[PDB]
Coordinates of C-alpha atoms and ligand atoms in Angstrom, one line a residue:
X1 CA 55.9 -102.1 -6.6
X2 CA 56.1 -100.1 -3.2
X3 CA 53.1 -100.3 -0.9
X4 CA 52.0 -99.4 2.6
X5 CA 52.3 -103.0 3.6
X6 CA 55.9 -103.2 2.2
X7 CA 56.8 -100.1 4.0
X8 CA 55.3 -101.5 7.3
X9 CA 57.3 -104.8 7.0
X10 CA 60.6 -103.5 5.7
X11 CA 60.9 -100.1 7.3
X12 CA 58.7 -99.8 10.3
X13 CA 58.7 -103.4 11.6
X14 CA 61.4 -103.0 14.4
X15 CA 59.6 -99.9 15.7
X16 CA 56.0 -101.0 15.8
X17 CA 55.7 -101.5 19.6
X18 CA 58.1 -98.6 20.7
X19 CA 56.4 -95.9 22.9
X20 CA 59.2 -93.5 21.8
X21 CA 62.0 -93.4 19.3
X22 CA 65.5 -92.0 19.7
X23 CA 66.7 -89.4 17.1
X24 CA 68.8 -92.3 16.0
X25 CA 65.9 -94.6 15.1
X26 CA 63.9 -91.9 13.5
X27 CA 67.0 -91.3 11.3
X28 CA 67.0 -95.1 10.4
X29 CA 63.4 -94.9 9.2
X30 CA 64.1 -92.0 6.8
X31 CA 67.3 -93.6 5.4
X32 CA 65.5 -96.9 5.0
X33 CA 62.3 -95.4 3.5
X34 CA 64.2 -93.1 1.1
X35 CA 66.3 -96.1 0.1
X36 CA 63.3 -98.2 -0.8
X37 CA 61.8 -95.4 -2.9
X38 CA 65.0 -95.2 -4.9
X39 CA 64.9 -99.0 -5.7
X40 CA 61.1 -98.9 -6.3
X41 CA 58.4 -96.7 -7.5
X42 CA 55.2 -96.0 -5.5
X43 CA 52.3 -98.1 -6.6
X44 CA 49.5 -96.2 -5.3
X45 CA 47.8 -92.9 -4.5
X46 CA 47.0 -94.6 -1.2
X47 CA 50.7 -95.2 -0.7
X48 CA 51.8 -91.6 -1.7
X49 CA 49.3 -90.2 0.8
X50 CA 50.7 -92.6 3.5
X51 CA 54.5 -91.9 2.9
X52 CA 53.8 -88.1 3.4
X53 CA 53.9 -88.6 7.1
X54 CA 57.6 -89.6 6.9
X55 CA 59.0 -86.9 4.6
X56 CA 59.9 -83.2 5.1
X57 CA 59.9 -80.9 2.1
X58 CA 63.8 -81.3 2.0
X59 CA 63.6 -85.1 2.3
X60 CA 61.4 -85.1 -0.7
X61 CA 63.7 -82.7 -2.6
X62 CA 66.6 -85.2 -2.0
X63 CA 64.4 -88.1 -2.9
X64 CA 63.9 -86.6 -6.4
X65 CA 67.6 -85.9 -6.9
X66 CA 68.5 -89.5 -5.8
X67 CA 65.9 -90.7 -8.3
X68 CA 67.4 -88.7 -11.2
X69 CA 70.9 -90.1 -10.3
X70 CA 69.2 -93.4 -10.9
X71 CA 67.5 -92.5 -14.2
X72 CA 64.0 -92.2 -12.8
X73 CA 61.5 -89.4 -12.9
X74 CA 61.5 -87.6 -9.6
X75 CA 57.8 -88.1 -9.0
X76 CA 57.8 -91.3 -7.0
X77 CA 54.8 -92.8 -8.6
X78 CA 56.4 -92.8 -12.1
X79 CA 57.9 -96.0 -13.5
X80 CA 59.4 -93.9 -16.4
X81 CA 62.6 -92.0 -16.4
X82 CA 63.3 -88.3 -16.7
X83 CA 63.1 -86.4 -20.1
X84 CA 66.8 -85.4 -20.3
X85 CA 69.6 -86.1 -17.7
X86 CA 64.5 -76.2 -17.1
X87 CA 62.7 -78.8 -14.8
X88 CA 63.1 -81.5 -17.5
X89 CA 66.3 -82.9 -15.9
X90 CA 64.1 -83.9 -12.9
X91 CA 60.9 -85.2 -14.5
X92 CA 59.5 -87.1 -17.5
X93 CA 57.0 -84.4 -18.5
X94 CA 55.8 -81.0 -17.4
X95 CA 52.8 -82.7 -15.9
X96 CA 54.8 -84.8 -13.4
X97 CA 56.7 -81.7 -12.5
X98 CA 53.5 -80.0 -11.3
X99 CA 52.2 -83.2 -9.7
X100 CA 55.5 -83.3 -7.8
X101 CA 55.4 -79.7 -6.7
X102 CA 51.7 -80.1 -5.8
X103 CA 52.7 -83.0 -3.5
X104 CA 55.7 -81.3 -2.0
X105 CA 54.0 -78.1 -1.2
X106 CA 51.8 -80.1 1.3
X107 CA 54.7 -81.7 3.1
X108 CA 55.4 -80.4 6.6
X109 CA 58.8 -78.9 7.6
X110 CA 58.4 -80.2 11.1
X111 CA 61.3 -82.5 11.8
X112 CA 60.4 -86.1 11.7
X113 CA 61.5 -86.7 15.3
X114 CA 58.9 -84.2 16.5
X115 CA 56.0 -85.9 14.8
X116 CA 54.7 -87.8 17.9
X117 CA 53.8 -91.4 17.2
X118 CA 54.5 -91.1 13.4
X119 CA 55.9 -94.7 13.5
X120 CA 52.6 -96.1 14.9
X121 CA 50.0 -98.1 12.9
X122 CA 47.6 -95.8 14.6
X123 CA 48.9 -92.3 13.9
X124 CA 46.6 -89.6 12.6
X125 CA 48.0 -87.1 10.0
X126 CA 47.0 -83.3 10.6
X127 CA 45.4 -83.2 7.1
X128 CA 44.7 -85.5 4.1
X129 CA 47.3 -85.1 1.5
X130 CA 46.0 -84.4 -2.0
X131 CA 47.3 -85.8 -5.3
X132 CA 47.1 -83.9 -8.6
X133 CA 44.4 -85.2 -11.1
Ligands
ZN1 ZN1 57.2 -89.2 -14.5

């Protein structure tokens, strides 16, 4: 149900013409993004690769735990719930555990605020994020 387009309209919209953001606005983007990905699952490989530019490894760790609190598998692409509320309290299967780890291990630790132009339609990520399978 979550898409690049939905993220651009609901999260990024106020910021689209800003040359620069304050720490404060960058903080609003995370909070709003993270919040959308609790209410919704990610539709798309395309959309997983896109959301990577907004998450640090920690942000992703919190995303998973907030998803467990809400009875969904930690891997954002998964419409199913976890297996049982070692890693099986976080994921539906072993396979989504690895998929999740595979994803996270690519996320930068560079603070969001320091990712110049990350809010722009036009931004270029340092590498293409890979999804397991
Ligand atoms: Zn799952």
